[PDB]
Design a protein around this ligand. Sequence first.
Ligand SMILES: COc1ccc(C2=NN(C3CCCCCC3)C(=O)[C@@H]3CC=CC[C@H]23)cc1OCCN1CCNC1=O
Ligand SMILES: [Mg+2]
Ligand SMILES: [Zn+2]
Length: 329
Amino acid sequence: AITNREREAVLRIEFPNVDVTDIDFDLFQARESTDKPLDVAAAIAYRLLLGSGLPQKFGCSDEVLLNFILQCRKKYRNVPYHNFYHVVDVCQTIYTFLYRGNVYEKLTELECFVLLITALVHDLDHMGLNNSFYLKTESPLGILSSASGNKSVLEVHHCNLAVEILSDPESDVFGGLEGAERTLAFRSMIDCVLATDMARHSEFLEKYLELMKTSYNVDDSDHRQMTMDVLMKAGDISNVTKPFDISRQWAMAVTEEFYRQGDMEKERGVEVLPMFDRSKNMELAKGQIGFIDFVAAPFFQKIVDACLQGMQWTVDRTKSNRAQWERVL
Ligand SMILES: COc1ccc(C2=NN(C3CCCCCC3)C(=O)[C@@H]3CC=CC[C@H]23)cc1OCCN1CCNC1=O
Ligand SMILES: [Mg+2]
Ligand SMILES: [Zn+2]
């Protein structure tokens, strides 16, 4: 259970002059303009969610929401990219897709609450190593994945820890729900987290696009779940949709993390993909262009054109940053 001093250090932070709901919100500046960035990161998620009125509508008390955010924070490690700031960023970004991009019309209010909560658990206990690393090294989590027949090594791990956090009534943000609602909350959270495995990127993307070939049915379960998976995925790959100074800082962080994995693979005598090679060097600009061309740009263009017209800015900023990385060359 959380200490009173730990809760007070977060509770006391407010943002009257910095709008945490804006598409231009700068998390790097929020971290850099305080001596307690992990407390400010937790307060951003706390104030964003209480500010929405969503937890209150689903019987999640302020204290339970805070206990939950701090329990999540405790399970994030000191790695360059997959740290607590990434999930706070994903939470904030998804909030913009829902309420600035109008995707809230495509989901129920409960599903919006579930998605924002899911953003905070989606990478619990990441060590800055991808799924492939655990399998190539025969690490315990890889062995567990292989034996249990689940190829999403880390995503299943993230689900286990999410369920553990929520098993404590004092951090159960779904504790105010009952019956079908409570079942939907756990089921949707788990499916959203499992949808973040990038080995399944094209699978989830094309499954969504095909269900959207026939008129979107907001009355349908599969339709809303696929929208939730697509929005979780969109937040995960949203660093390319931000202002350049921000998008560049995310690129630096992911590069440093990837390079540390590559150094660990070199030390262990396992295969190193060029993207993870520290000593060998690739231009940051080349890496981001590749990521945009083969992953981010087709994903956002396709989801915007099929249904998410309000998220058109994601397509525009991706091109703006892509053209900026071309100039950096
Ligand atoms: C800010 O830039 C990036 C942010 C996140 C990612 C992710 N990639 N993937 C894979 C990596 C393999 C190749 C394509 C498929 C995506 C993941 O599974 C990560 C975890 C989940 C979601 C996306 C994350 C990648 C980025 O730049 C890549 C370009 N590179 C890599 C090194 N530098 C650089 O610019
Ligand atoms: Mg992940
Ligand atoms: Zn993530």
